[PDB]
Amino acid sequence: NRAQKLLHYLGHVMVNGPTTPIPVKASPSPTDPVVPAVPIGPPPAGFRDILLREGPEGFARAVRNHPGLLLMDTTFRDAHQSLLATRVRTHDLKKIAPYVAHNFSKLFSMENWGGATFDVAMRFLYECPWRRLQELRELIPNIPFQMLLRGANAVGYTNYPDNVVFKFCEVAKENGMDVFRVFDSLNYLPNMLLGMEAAGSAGGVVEAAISYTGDVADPSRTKYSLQYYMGLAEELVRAGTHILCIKDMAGLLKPTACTMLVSSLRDRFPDLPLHIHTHDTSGAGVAAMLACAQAGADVVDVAADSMSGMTSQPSMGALVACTRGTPLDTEVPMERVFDYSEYWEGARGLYAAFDCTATMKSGNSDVYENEIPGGQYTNLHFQAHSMGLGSKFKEVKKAYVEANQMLGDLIKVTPSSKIVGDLAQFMVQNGLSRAEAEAQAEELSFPRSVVEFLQGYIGVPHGGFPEPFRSKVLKDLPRVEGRPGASLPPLDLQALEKELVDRHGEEVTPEDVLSAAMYPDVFAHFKDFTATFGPLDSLNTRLFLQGPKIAEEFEVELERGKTLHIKALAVSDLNRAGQRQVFFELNGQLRSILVKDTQAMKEMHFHPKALKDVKGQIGAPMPGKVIDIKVVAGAKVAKGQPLCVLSAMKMETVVTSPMEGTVRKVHVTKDMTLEGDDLILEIE
Amino acid sequence: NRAQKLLHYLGHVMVNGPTTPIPVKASPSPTDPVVPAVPIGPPPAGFRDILLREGPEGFARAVRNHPGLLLMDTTFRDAHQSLLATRVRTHDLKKIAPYVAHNFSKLFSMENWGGATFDVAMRFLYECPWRRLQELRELIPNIPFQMLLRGANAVGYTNYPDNVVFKFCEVAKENGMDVFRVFDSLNYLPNMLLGMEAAGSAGGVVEAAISYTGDVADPSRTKYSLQYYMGLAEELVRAGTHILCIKDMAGLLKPTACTMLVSSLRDRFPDLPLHIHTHDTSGAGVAAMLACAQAGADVVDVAADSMSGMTSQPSMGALVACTRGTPLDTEVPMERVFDYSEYWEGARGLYAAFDCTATMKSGNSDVYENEIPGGQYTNLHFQAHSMGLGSKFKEVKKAYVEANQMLGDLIKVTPSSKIVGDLAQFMVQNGLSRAEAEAQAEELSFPRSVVEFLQGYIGVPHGGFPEPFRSKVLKDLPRVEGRPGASLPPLDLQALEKELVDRHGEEVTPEDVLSAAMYPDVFAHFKDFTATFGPLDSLNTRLFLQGPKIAEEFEVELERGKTLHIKALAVSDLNRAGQRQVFFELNGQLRSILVKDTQAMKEMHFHPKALKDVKGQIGAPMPGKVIDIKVVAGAKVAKGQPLCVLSAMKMETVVTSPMEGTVRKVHVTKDMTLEGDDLILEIE
Amino acid sequence: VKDTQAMKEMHFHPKALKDVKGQIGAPMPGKVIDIKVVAGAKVAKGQPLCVLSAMKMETVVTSPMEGTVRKVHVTKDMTLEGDDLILEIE
Ligand SMILES: *C(=O)CCCC[C@@H]1SC[C@@H]2NC(=O)N[C@@H]21
Numbered sequence A, B: 001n002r003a004q005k006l007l008h009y010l011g012h013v014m015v016n017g018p019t020t021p022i023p024v025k026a027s028p029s030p031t032d033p034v035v036p037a038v039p040i041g042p043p044p045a046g047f048r049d050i051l052l053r054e055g056p057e058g059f060a061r062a063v064r065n066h067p068g069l070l071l072m073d074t075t076f077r078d079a080h081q082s083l084l085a086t087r088v089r090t091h092d093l094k095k096i097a098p099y100v101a102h103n104f105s106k107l108f109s110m111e112n113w114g115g116a117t118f119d120v121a122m123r124f125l126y127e128c129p130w131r132r133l134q135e136l137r138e139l140i141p142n143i144p145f146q147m148l149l150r151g152a153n154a155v156g157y158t159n160y161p162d163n164v165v166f167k168f169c170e171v172a173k174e175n176g177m178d179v180f181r182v183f184d185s186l187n188y189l190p191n192m193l194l195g196m197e198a199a200g201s202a203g204g205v206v207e208a209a210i211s212y213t214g215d216v217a218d219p220s221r222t223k224y225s226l227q228y229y230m231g232l233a234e235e236l237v238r239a240g241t242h243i244l245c246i247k248d249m250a251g252l253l254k255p256t257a258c259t260m261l262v263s264s265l266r267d268r269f270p271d272l273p274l275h276i277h278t279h280d281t282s283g284a285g286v287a288a289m290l291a292c293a294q295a296g297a298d299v300v301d302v303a304a305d306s307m308s309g310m311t312s313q314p315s316m317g318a319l320v321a322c323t324r325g326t327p328l329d330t331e332v333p334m335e336r337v338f339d340y341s342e343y344w345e346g347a348r349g350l351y352a353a354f355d356c357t358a359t360m361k362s363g364n365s366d367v368y369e370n371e372i373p374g375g376q377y378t379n380l381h382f383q384a385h386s387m388g389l390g391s392k393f394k395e396v397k398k399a400y401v402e403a404n405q406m407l408g409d410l411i412k413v414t415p416s417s418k419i420v421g422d423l424a425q426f427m428v429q430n431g432l433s434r435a436e437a438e439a440q441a442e443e444l445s446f447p448r449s450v451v452e453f454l455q456g457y458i459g460v461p462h463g464g465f466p467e468p469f470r471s472k473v474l475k476d477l478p479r480v481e482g483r484p485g486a487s488l489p490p491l492d493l494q495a496l497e498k499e500l501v502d503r504h505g506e507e508v509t510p511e512d513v514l515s516a517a518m519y520p521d522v523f524a525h526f527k528d529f530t531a532t533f534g535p536l537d538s539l540n541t542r543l544f545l546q547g548p549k550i551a552e553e554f555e556v557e558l559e560r561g562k563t564l565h566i567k568a569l570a571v572s573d574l575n576r577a578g579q580r581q582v583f584f585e586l587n588g589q590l591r592s593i594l595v596k597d598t599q600a601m602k603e604m605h606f607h608p609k610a611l612k613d614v615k616g617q618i619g620a621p622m623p624g625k626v627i628d629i630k631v632v633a634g635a636k637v638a639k640g641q642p643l644c645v646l647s648a649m650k651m652e653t654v655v656t657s658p659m660e661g662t663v664r665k666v667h668v669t670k671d672m673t674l675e676g677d678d679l680i681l682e683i684e
Numbered sequence C: 001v002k003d004t005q006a007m008k009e010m011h012f013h014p015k016a017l018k019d020v021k022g023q024i025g026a027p028m029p030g031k032v033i034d035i036k037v038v039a040g041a042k043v044a045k046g047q048p049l050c051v052l053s054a055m056k057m058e059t060v061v062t063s064p065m066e067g068t069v070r071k072v073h074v075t076k077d078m079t080l081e082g083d084d085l086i087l088e089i090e
C-alpha cells in the first residue's frame, strides 16, 4: 500500500512541528486564490512552432524582425528568491498553466528553473525537478521556457568536470528544453566559452549574459570602464552566439547609463536581439528600463504585479500602461493581467509565514554602497536567523562592504556573493574590526569557501586579487593555476549507476544519477526520506506545511482516479514511551496510527546504585544527609570498622566496612543527602 | 495636579486595553529608532531669509530664477495617511527637526499641516494641533512650512461661512504659517475663487492646485480634454497666483502625457514656477516625474525613502542618485539621506499595530479601473473593518466604479471620494447591483451624505448630474442653487466663545475657539479627556499605546525642570466591584491607585423573593419541584385550602391558603424549580 | 521575600577564555564532524586539528600555535555554541 506512509506523515506533523524550519512564526491564511476561467480549445500558436519549423538562428531572426517589444516573465524563477526563500511547491504551480498557455501567446518566454532551484527542491522541499518540469511541458506546448545556467559550475558552487557539464546540458536539452542562458560569476572567458560550447553541443538557442556593476557614466568609476565592457562584448560576439543579454543583479542602471550603453552596442551590432535583466530594488528600475528600451532594446524581463517591487522585477501593469500610445505597442489585454495578479496576491498569503516584509518593510536605498544581489538578500536573512544572528542582521550587512574591500571591487552573483556573505558572517560573529582582521589574517581560521576561492577553484578575476592576504590564508596550501575545469580530473559516472542501484536503487534514472553526482549527500537523504513517507506534492500547501486541523474532512488525490476523503478526530496522549495514537477517517473507514513523539528526552542522572551481585560494593542502608566520612579513597579498612555516619531525621546508622581490605574510591562529597542502597564506596 | 492624572491614566491602560481603536492586534518591537548626530551651531539660512527679506512675488521670482530644481518633503503630511492612519504623535516627530534644520537647507519647503491632520488630532489622537505647530516653527526657523487647504470647507467636509475661512486664514498667517495650497476636489470655480481670495486676505504666498484625472493623451478621453484643462489653467492664471500645481491622487501620470502637458503649458507661461505632486501607486510614477521634470518642472514633491513608493510618493534616494551628473543638479549630500531614512525605518515598526502591509502587500495595478484616491485607501480599509466589512473589503472596492458610474465620471479627492465610498458601502452591505440599485432609488433609504451631495451643497459639477436619480432620491427636499457658501448666513463667533468658556472654558484661546467652531463635539470631548487625565503628548509612543510593563523603570519628563521616574510593581485583582489596585515606584517612594474595571458585568434574574411584611404574599416553604397548582389566577381561595404541591426527594408538601381571598397572579408559574421563600401566590 | 524555589539550571559548555591563548574556542556554533587529534598529542602550527559543521558552510580549525595539546573537551557529534572551550594548546 501507500496510504500508511502519508497517514504516518500527517500524524507526525500533528504531533511534531513542520519538518522544514520556520523563519518567522505565523500561520497560512484561510483563503484559496481564485483561479481565472480558461477556454477549452487547444492553446494558440506562440513561438515553439516558430523554433520548431526553423533553426535557432531563423527563430532569432524572426524575433528581431518583429516590430515592437517582447516580454520575459521571471515570476516562476526570480520572484521566488526575490520575495521568498524559493519555497513554492509545484502543486500550487500546476493551477494556472492552462490559463497562461491559452491566454498568453504573445509572451516571449518563461523562466522556471534556475540556479538555486534544485538545492532546495530536495533539501528543504522534497520533490524531483525533472518530474515537475516534465509535468509542465504538456501543460504549455505553446511558449518556450528558459534555463538559467552558470558557466563552469553547472548547478553547484564549484567548477564541475567538463564532461559532467556537457552531458548534463545534453540531458537537459533532451528533456524538451528550449532556451538556455550562459553566465559566469566572474568574467572568466574560458568559463563562458565552456558554457556556450556545452549549449551548442546540446543544440538550441544559446544566450550569454554579462554582469553589470558600478557606473559607466561616472568618469571616476574606472575599474569597469565602457571600453572594458566593449571588449567583453566584442570577444563574446566573436565567439558567436544567438542572443546577447545584460544582468543587473542589484538594480543599478540609471536611464542615461543604459541608454548610452545600448547606443554603443546597437551601433556596432544592429542585427542582434538585445535582452535585459534587472532587479527593481532602488525603485528607479522601471524608468531606466523603459527609457533604454525605447532606445534600442528588444526583450525585457518583468514580474507579475503582486510579485513585483521591493527587489523583484517591475510589474506587468506599469510596462503595459506606459507602452500604450507608443510605436513599441506591447498590445496585451490587461484584464488577464489583472486576474493573474489577483491569483498571485491570493497565493502569496499561503507562504506568509516567511517573507521579507516582516524585516524589509519598504524598498531601501544605499544598495550602491551595499551592492547586495537581489536574489540573495532574503536567503541571507533566513540563514542569519537560523545561525542565531538574525537579531544583529543590520550589522551583518554593515560588515559586508569591508569584506568587499577585502576581496576588492569584484562582480559577485551566485558563488562570490555568498562567499562575501560568509566572510562577513565570520566577521560579525567574532565582532572584530577590518584593519586588524587584515593584520592577523595568518593564524585566523577561515571558512572553507574562502579558502576555495583564494586557491582559485573558480578562475582568475578580471582585476586580479591581493597577494599578501592569499599568502596569509593559503600559506602552505596547494594552489590551483590555470583553468580549474581543465585541471580537474574527468571522472566516470557509470559506476555511480550501479552503486546507487545496489545500495537503494531499483528504478533510478540517469537524471537521478546526475542529481547524485551533483549533491550526493542531500540526494540520498531526500531519497530515503521520500521512501519513508511516500510521495509528496499531492496535497494542499497549507495541508503540507500546517497539516489538517482537528475535526474536519478534506480530500487528497493520488492520481487521476485515486482521490480520497479524509477526516481526523483527535489525538491520544503519551502512553508509555512518548508515543501518540491518532484516529483518521477514510471515505467510510476509521484508522488508528502510532506516532513516536520526539519531545520526550527526559535526561536524568543519579548517584551510582550499589549492585548486590558485587559483594565488595557497599550500599547506603538509610537515606539521609551524610554527616562525616571516616575513610578516604584508596585507604585500608578493617572489618566492621566505622567509615560513614548517616542521619536523616530520627535514626542514625554508622556504615562499617563489612570485609577486611582497602577501598578503591568513595562517591561521597560529605555534604549531600543520599538515598539508601547507593554505591557510596567499594571494597576490593 | 498632573502626576496623579497620568498615573491614573497608566493604571487604566494597564487594566483595560488601549483607548484608541486597534485595527490589527500586534505590538511594536522593543527597539528605539537611531537618532543621527547633530552639530551645535545655529541652523543656516535657506529661503525663510528670502521671505522675510522679500515679498511673495519677489520670493517666487527668486525661486524661478534658480538654475536647477527644488525638492519637497511630504513625510510629515502625506505619507501619514498614505501608509498609516495619520496617527503619528509629535513626540517622536520632534526628534529630527534639529537634525534637518542643520543638515537640510536646500528644501524648497516642508509640509506639516494638512486637511486630515486636525480631525485626527482631536478624535483618535488627544493633542492640540495649534500647540504642536507652536513648537515646530521654533525648531525650524530655516524652511517655510506648507499647508493644503480646501475652499468651501476650510478643514471640514461641508460648506463653511466665508467669514470663518477668512478668519482661519488670518489666524494661520499670524501663526507664522508660510506656504498655502488652495485646491478643491471639484473644479467649481467660485470655490477656488473664494479660496484664493482668502489666501490674499491672509497675505503671503498663494499656491493653487489642479487635479489631473483621466488620460490627456487619449483621444477617446473627451470629458476633460487638454483644452478643458488649458482653459482651467488660463482662468486660474487670469485670477493671478504665485505657483500652480497638478494634483494626482491616483498617480496616473504617463510620462508622455505629463511631458506634453508641461511643454504645452510652459510655452504660454515662461515665467511661472512649476510645482508637481503625485502618489506612486501604479509604480511607474518616477519615470513620468523624471521625464516631465526634465521638460519644464521646477518644484517636485517627494516622500522619504522608508515611506516611499508602494502607495506613497517616490523616494529621496532614487531622485538624488539618478540626477547626479545632470544639469538639473540636485546637489544634495546623500549621506545624510541614509540616516534620515533609517530613523524613519526604525520608527515605522513602532506603529506596527496598523499598516498597509497586512492587507495591501505590493503596489497593485488596476488603479485605472477603481480610480480610488491614494491617501484615503488605508482609512477606507480601517473603516470597513470597523463596520466589520473589512473581511469582505475586496467587495467594497469592486463596487466603487459602479458608484462612480451612478455619479458619472467625476473628480473626487476629499469629500466626493468619501461620498462614493459611503455609497459603495451601502450598496455592498445591501447586496445591490447596478440596475437593481438604480431601479428602486425612491423607497430605499440612502445615506445622509449622499443626500447632502445630491442636494448640491458642495456645488454643481463640471457636467452636472443625472436628473431621474436626483428626483427619485431627493423627492421634494429643499434645493439650493448657486454657491451655497454665499447662501450660508454669516455666523458670529463671539457669543460662542462665552458659551464654551462658561461651559468648560477658563482661559481659552481663539485657536481653540476656531477649533470648536469647525468641530465643537470632538473639541468638547478632547477638552474633557484632557481635564480628566491631564496634559498628554509627553509619553513614548510604545509607552503611550502599550503602557509601562511590570518590573520596569523609565523616565517621563513633564516640564523642563519637571522630570521624574516611574516603575511598575504589580496588579491586584477584582476586589468587590471590578476595581484593581496597582502600585508604582516614585523616584524614591511608592504610590497606590484604584482603577474601575469594565469587563465586570453583574446581573440579577429568576424568580424574586416573597416579602415577609406582606402577609398576602405567599412564599415557597421548601425548595423543590412544582408538581400541580390547585388554584388558577383569578379564582376565589378559601382559608386552609390547598394551593400547590412540592416534592423533591421524599418530602411532599401542600401549600395551604394563609387567608380567604381570590388569587390575583400565579407567580409560581409551572414546571420550574423553586427554592424556599419564593413568592408563589399573591393575595390582595 | 527570598524564594527558596530557585532551581538553577546547568548548561556545561566550557568557555575558552580569549586571553588564554592555549584555550581554543569555536569560531562558529554547530555540530563537530571529526577531530584529527587526541588529547595530549603534538601538533604543528597552521595544521588541521578539528572540523566544525554548519547548515551550509564549513570551517576547518587552524592550529593556534606549535605545541602539544592537553585536553579535548568535545569528543564527537554534539552541537556547540560560539567560542566553546573544546581544546587547549600547550
Ligand atoms: C540555500 O538553500 C541555497 C540558496 C542560497 C544560495 C543561493 S545561490 C544563488 C544565490 N546567490 C547566493 O549567494 N545565494 C543564493
Ligand SMILES: *C(=O)CCCC[C@@H]1SC[C@@H]2NC(=O)N[C@@H]21
Pocket (backbone or CB within 6 Å): B115, B116, B119, B123, B376, B379, B413, B414, B415, B417, B418
Ligand atoms: C475620520 O476619522 C477622518 C479621516 C477620514 C477623512 C480624510 S480627509 C481627507 C481624506 N479624504 C477622505 O475622504 N478621507 C480622508
